[PDB]
Amino acid sequence: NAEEKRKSARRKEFIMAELIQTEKAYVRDLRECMDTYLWEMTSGVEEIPPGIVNKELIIFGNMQEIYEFHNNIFLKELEKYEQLPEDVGHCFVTWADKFQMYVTYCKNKPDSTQLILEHAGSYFDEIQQRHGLANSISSYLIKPVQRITKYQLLLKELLTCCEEGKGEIKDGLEVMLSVPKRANDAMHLSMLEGFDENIESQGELILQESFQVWDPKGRERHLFLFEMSLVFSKEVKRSKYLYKSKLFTSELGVTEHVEGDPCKFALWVGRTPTSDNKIVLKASSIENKQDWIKHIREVIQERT
Amino acid sequence: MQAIKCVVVGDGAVGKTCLLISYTTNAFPGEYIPTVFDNYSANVMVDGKPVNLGLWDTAGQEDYDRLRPLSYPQTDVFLICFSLVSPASFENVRAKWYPEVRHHCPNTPIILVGTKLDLRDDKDTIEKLKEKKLTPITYPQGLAMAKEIGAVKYLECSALTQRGLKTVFDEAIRAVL
């Protein structure tokens, strides 16, 4: 299979080269954004609008943290494995927690963006006109959000081309799929309104999804699965969640198979799963139902 | 020198990244189709009215319903792209993309693009779709869906042969003007 080997090696080299040469461009764009728009706000001479003064941390988030992570550590690691594309996933395992900063960044994106269109006015447009930059401020700001969702695609491409070392690539792919999932979960949780308790008191969020719930007719209840609770919340008009009820996971129990529909499963509380007090939830697909069953059972096992 | 922003939205298999690479580089990628397409901005002269067109690619943001709409605010025009050899994307156009785009941007114009025009007449794709009781999307179906979602214009393009690819962005620019 000479053709197979040729295609595999050529595509692998192309993917690794793109992985390095786009990381370099991302670092360059972050540096330009820091040295062009942020610098005017911090150590500039122009008249800052009254509504955006002393608020550069809100607008730019922790972009400086991301830059100092990529510019000093991550790129040097990605350049080490340029001749060994099969092990690049390892670089995504050692610094797995270091990407948690991205989870922060997206959470600040709705806060920052509105501010630019609420009090900045024509400040950054005038800065771009004076500096003669092609990109606007939002074009630079959106870049980490795009970049966190590009590693998974490259890892998937490298997954189908490697014959050995598939485990390392698979682990890196799992990490780089988990990170955007947590970023989306945090943005969903940020709209939870009315919770009369402490968010951190419930542990970490694990899953969130919208279901049809029959209260012991089907009513929509977005569910949040924390390590110590399950929160049923209604969704009302924007997209804000109203805290409706919670169930302690230790007392929770699951019925996996419910007759009449393959997408329904039951949750109950108390020692005895007595009838007429069963919360019936209809998943959107078989895969969603199975994943929710597995995660809920894992939570229950953890609590005991 | 008016600045115009164009955001492409579609499923993963539609082929938006290649759709943009072939337009910007004026050549099909060839052996390797790029995975990453950084935001684009260039001067385009249309009808004696030069503009600065910027192109936004939303690849990799399909399975993230909250990270995805971060690029929607302040968008001049949308390109809702589907594939002509995959009716699933054609249904997701009216199921997923149009409701979200019209919810976040109630007044932004939309152009309905159908990609992979070159594979429509292939005798292998047709057989593979027949094995699953599927047929390629014809032009009248695309036109009907474009009239359904109130899109400004329905267009078909092919990144491999660049047939109709230059007209898509010109029509998108002309929609704003």
Residue numbers in the entry:
A (entry chain A): 1282 to 1497, 1503 to 1523, 1528 to 1594
B (entry chain B): 1 to 177
Authors' account:
Trio is a large and highly conserved metazoan signaling scaffold that contains two Dbl family guanine nucleotide exchange factor (GEF) modules, TrioN and TrioC, selective for Rac and RhoA GTPases, respectively. Dbl family GEF modules are composed of a Dbl homology (DH) domain that binds Rho GTPases followed by a regulatory pleckstrin homology (PH) domain. The N-terminal GEF module of Trio (TrioN) catalyzes nucleotide exchange on Rac subfamily members, whereas the C-terminal module (TrioC) catalyzes nucleotide exchange on RhoA subfamily members. We found that regions C-terminal to TrioN enhance its Rac1 GEF activity and thus could play a regulatory role.
We chose Trio1284-1959 for this analysis because its molecular weight (78 kDa) was potentially large enough to get a high resolution reconstruction and also because it was the most well-behaved and highest yielding Trio variant. Cryo-EM single particle analysis ultimately yielded a 2.9 Å map, which is unusually high resolution for what ended up being a ∼55 kDa structure (not considering regions that ended up disordered). The final model contains residues 1 to 177 of Rac1, and residues 1284 to 1594 of Trio. However, there was no obvious density for any domain or residues C terminal to the Trio PH domain. Comparison of the complex, which may be the first of a RhoGEF DH/PH module by single particle cryo-EM, with that of the TrioN–Rac1 crystal structure reveals few differences. More residues of the PH domain are ordered in the cryo-EM structure, and the domain is rotated about 4° with respect to the DH domain relative to that of the crystal structure. Density for the N-terminal helix of the cryo-EM DH domain extends outward by eight additional residues, and residues 26 to 31 in Switch 1 of Rac1 adopt a markedly different conformation. The linker region we showed to confer activation (residues 1719–1959) are likely disordered because they all exchange within 10 s after the start of the experiment. However, analysis of the Trio1284-1959–Rac1 complex using cryo-EM did not find evidence for any ordered portion of the 1719 to 1959 region that might facilitate complex formation. We created and purified deletion variants of each span (Trio1284-1959,Δ1772-1784 and Trio1284-1959,Δ1867-1873) and compared their GEF activity against those of TrioN and Trio1284-1959. Deletion of either conserved span led to reduction of Rac1 GEF activity to the same level as that of TrioN, indicating that both elements are essential for the increased catalytic proficiency of Trio1284–1959.
